[PDB]
């Protein structure tokens, strides 16, 4: 299948060169898999989700996304027009408030929640967890991320936007999960993207168009936008039967476009997420 005039990030992931505008993908499009977006919530009623999205847990007064960040990330994972895995099932867990902030204890609770909750869901092709969040190093937060991954969920986390070594940032510094850096449409590391040896892969993160609250759309930037590109790609590859939750990150790195990125510091991988689609 092919989405013509697709957002640059989607075209990039199914391309071997920058500057193309068609997103080529397998029609299975991630159906049968499930992706938990642990963020500010998801506007499930948005037309772009076609009823494939649902709030599953809040840690605040309401489960609605009053911020937009979570809805944006979810859209990149699996909305019809802006998503990587267009037929995946989306579950929202609101651990961040409408200002986009949350405390470590509730973020940890949200992760433990997902590890348990996936056991009551029908996700035959696999389960993915997308975490476009993070803060200063915390061994408890890293530990919660490692537990989720070991429970059998493919965990993808943002590297962070401090243009620094991701080793001092928690979600990102946990070695067992998939740490995602950001790149722009000219194949340069995004100027805000953290880097370092803990990064596993890079994904499109600068000026990413996706869904927004109020049934709208908006273009924003961040490793927060790169993360869902690979969470969505993992779901897509899992329903294709190419990999499993435990090895998806390594599989994505193994099959990535290598050496294409510029502005990559020595010691940081030069790998860009690639679906390897051949029609
Ligand atoms: O990168 C991000 C990190 C955190 C940490 C808490 N909320 C966040 C939202 C972000 O977009
Ligand atoms: Ca090339
Ligand atoms: Ca890793």
Swiss-Prot record:
The active site is at 39 (charge relay system), 69 (charge relay system), 224 (charge relay system). The keyword Disulfide bond applies. GO terms for biological process: proteolysis. Keywords: Calcium, Disulfide bond, Hydrolase, Metal-binding, Protease, Serine protease, Signal, Zymogen. One of its GO terms (cellular component) is extracellular region. Its EC number is 3.4.21.64. Ca(2+) 2 binds at residues 16, 260. Binds 2 calcium ions per subunit. Belongs to the peptidase S8 family. This is Proteinase K. It comes from Parengyodontium album. The lineage of its organism: Eukaryota, Fungi, Dikarya, Ascomycota, Pezizomycotina. The gene is PROK. The chain holds residues 106 to 384 of 384 of the full protein.
């Amino acid at each position: 299948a092919a989405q013509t005039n697709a957002p640059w990030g989607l075209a990039r992931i199914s391309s071997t060169s920058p500057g193309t505008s068609t997103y080529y993908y397998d029609e299975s499009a991630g159906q049968g898999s499930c992706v938990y977006v642990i963020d500010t919530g998801i506007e499930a009623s948005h037309p772009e989700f076609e009823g494939r999205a649902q709030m599953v847990k809040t840690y605040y007064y309401s489960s609605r996304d009053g911020n937009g960040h979570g809805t944006h990330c979810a859209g990149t994972v699996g909305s019809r027009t802006y998503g990587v895995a267009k037929k995946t099932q989306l579950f929202g867990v609101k651990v961040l408030d409408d200002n986009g902030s949350g405390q470590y204890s509730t973020i940890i609770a949200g992760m433990d929640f997902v590890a348990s909750d996936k056991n009551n869901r029908n996700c035959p092709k696999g389960v993915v967890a997308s975490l476009s969040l993070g803060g200063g190093y915390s061994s408890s937060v890293n530990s919660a991320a490692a537990r989720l991954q070991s429970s059998g969920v493919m965990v993808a986390v943002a590297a962070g936007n401090n243009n620094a070594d991701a080793r001092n940032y928690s979600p990102a510094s946990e070695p067992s999960v998939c740490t995602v850096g950001a790149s722009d449409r000219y194949d340069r590391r995004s100027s805000f993207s953290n880097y370092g040896s803990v990064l596993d892969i890079f994904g499109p993160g600068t000026s990413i168009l996706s869904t927004w609250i109020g049934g709208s759309t908006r273009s924003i930037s961040g490793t927060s936008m790169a993360t869902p590109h690979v969470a969505g790609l993992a779901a897509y590859l899992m329903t294709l039967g190419k990999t499993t939750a435990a090895s998806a990150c390594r599989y994505i790195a193994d099959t990535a476009n290598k050496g294409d990125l510029s502005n990559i510091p020595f010691g940081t991988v030069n790998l860009l997420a690639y679906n390897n689609y051949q029609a």
